Design a protein around this ligand. Structure first.
Ligand SMILES: *[C@@H]1O[C@H](CO)[C@@H](O[C@@H]2O[C@H](C(=O)O)[C@@H](O[C@@H]3O[C@@H](C(=O)O)[C@@H](O)[C@H](OS(=O)(=O)O)[C@H]3O)[C@H](O)[C@H]2O)[C@H](O)[C@H]1O
Ligand SMILES: *[C@@H]1O[C@H](CO)[C@@H](O[C@@H]2O[C@H](C(=O)O)[C@@H](O[C@@H]3O[C@@H](C(=O)O)[C@@H](O)[C@H](OS(=O)(=O)O)[C@H]3O)[C@H](O)[C@H]2O)[C@H](O)[C@H]1O
Ligand SMILES: *[C@@H]1O[C@H](CO)[C@@H](O[C@@H]2O[C@H](C(=O)O)[C@@H](O[C@@H]3O[C@@H](C(=O)O)[C@@H](O)[C@H](OS(=O)(=O)O)[C@H]3O)[C@H](O)[C@H]2O)[C@H](O)[C@H]1O
Lengths: 178, 45
């Protein structure tokens, strides 16, 4: 008679094992997608960085009105999107964060393609894109020897900072190099 | 790319095939290719 009872408990442990078995696999399924994505973005956090080749600027009257930075992919950088990037401005007067706009809209920035196909995305290593920012709209133009702190923040998080240094004298200079 | 911060203009020049406008052209001085510096003795104008 004992054998009959064994079968039901036999079955009960069968599902109980499956219930116990399943949760680990579905859990491991959660981390395996979760961990893999974590490695990619963290790698993109350190690798997908932006490097400024140079930063010139047009000069009107006696004050810098434009600060154009020619940005470039860093070592091993993937397709960097500039439309999903922000620039933090730290100046003598104002101190805001600039987002991307189209065709400079004061508290924003605009990108023109110096070299390449796209005008908002760095695809290959050789493309250079110039980010236009109205210095005569985010602040009262730019005085001589004025110090601007730019922190170009990529989408993933790689922050490249820049110390903009206006020349101490702008005596008859059509365009300077900050 | 070549950046030209001159007395007047201040733009960036890109390669073209025979110069002018806002572009630069490369002719060969010592070597075979007129756009690539293959050798250490390669000289391009
Ligand atoms: C940052 O990069 C931007 C990229 O557009 C550059 O923009 C240009 O600035 C010119 C000027 O320095 O303000 C401006 O000039 C006017 O338009 C020119 C052209 O028709 O586009 C031209 O007529 C005259 O300028 S110039 O060619 O004699 O220098 C002028 O009427 C451009 O329209 C503008 O796109 C910034 O200069 C640079 O700092
Ligand atoms: C660099 O990052 C920019 C971020 O703006 C991206 O281009 C923009 O993508 C928008 C979207 O995220 O796809 C796209 O949006 C348009 O309008 C949407 C909606 O009506 O608001 C929708 O119709 C379309 O997008 S989507 O919903 O299918 O995703 C689209 O027509 C913007 O027009 C586009 O500039 C770049 O692609 C990237 O390289
Ligand atoms: C050689 O050094 C002189 C130093 O005087 C410099 O010219 C002077 O620069 C002043 C300033 O440092 O820019 C400028 O100041 C004026 O008054 C300011 C304020 O109201 O006091 C301000 O309005 C203006 O300057 S600024 O704040 O935009 O920088 C300005 O109207 C003097 O008028 C100017 O002679 C030379 O430029 C330098 O080559």
């Amino acid at each position: 008679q004992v054998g009959i009872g064994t079968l039901i408990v036999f079955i009960a442990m069968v599902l109980v094992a499956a219930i116990a078995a399943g949760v680990l696999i579905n859990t491991a399924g959660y981390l395996q997608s979760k961990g893999s994505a974590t490695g990619e973005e963290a790698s993109a956090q350190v690798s997908n960085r932006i490097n400024i080749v140079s930063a010139y600027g047009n000069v009107x009257x006696x004050x810098v009105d434009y600060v154009n930075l020619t940005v470039r992919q860093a070592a091993g950088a993937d397709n960097i999107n500039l439309x999903k990037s922000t620039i933090q401005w730290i100046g003598p007067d104002x101190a805001t964060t600039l987002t991307y706009x189209x065709x400079x809209x004061x508290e924003n920035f605009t990108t023109x393609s110096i070299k390449g196909x796209x005008x908002x995305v760095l695809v290959d290593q050789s493309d250079r894109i110039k980010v236009i920012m109205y210095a005569x709209x985010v602040x009262x133009x730019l005085x001589x020897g004025x110090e601007v702190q730019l922190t170009v923040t990529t989408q993933y998080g790689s922050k490249t900072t820049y110390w903009a240094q206006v020349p101490e004298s702008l005596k008859d200079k059509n365009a300077v190099x900050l």
